[PDB]
Amino acid sequence: SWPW
Amino acid sequence: IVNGEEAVPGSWPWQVSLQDKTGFHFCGGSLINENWVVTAAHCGVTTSDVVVAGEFDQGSSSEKIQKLKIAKVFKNSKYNSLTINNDITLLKLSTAASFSQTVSAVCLPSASDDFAAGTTCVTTGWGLTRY
């Protein structure tokens, strides 16, 4: 996951 | 947005761009009235960043955009950066936005409103189109  | 399409200019009039002092777009946001923008807490906005309203093409010099200064950042006290839960910040603008054909507010829901699985909604932004 990654902050968008 | 991956596999989206270009919007009609001005058709999402609450959409703002959050830019740093170098002019770099790093996050979106939404106008909820002339003085307040909603964005994500994890965007890490500071009062040195700028809210840009009325923009369509970030490569154009000819658009009548509004560059609005931020007075105060209100990060929701329930935001949990470890889980990215409650990911919301409010920005109070120093200078009110001037509403027009291309700049206006989105509605907020009631707390009890229902949006069912399977409903088709829309998202907008200047994020990457390919990874």
Partner: protein, 95 residues
């Protein structure tokens, strides 16, 4: 990155079904959307997920997080505005 503003339509998921993708990372103040051939991606964060209700566009989500490769077959995760709107209104009223 694009110069011009992009849009996409996409469906809302239930949190129970979103947990098949993301497991215990999905909390009550999140809502999932997508897995439909489109995805939000880096730089979309903070922007809107809007749904039309009684003729008006209403802010249902705030772009938050998702797949590190913006996979179009995995749902994106958005902050669930109905869970947060009471804090919005308390903040506006006090400031």
């Amino acid at each position: 990155t694009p110069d011009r503003l992009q849009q996409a339509s996409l469906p809302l998921l239930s949190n129970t079904n979103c947990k098949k993708y993301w497991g215990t990372k999905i909390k009550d103040a999140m809502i999932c959307a997508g897995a439909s051939g489109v995805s939000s991606c880096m730089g979309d964060s903070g922007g809107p997920l809007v749904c039309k209700k009684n003729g008006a566009w209403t802010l249902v989500g705030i772009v938050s997080w998702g797949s590190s490769t913006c996979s179009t077959s995995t749902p994106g995760v958005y902050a669930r505005v109905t869970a947060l709107v009471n804090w919005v209104q308390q903040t506006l009223a006090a400031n």
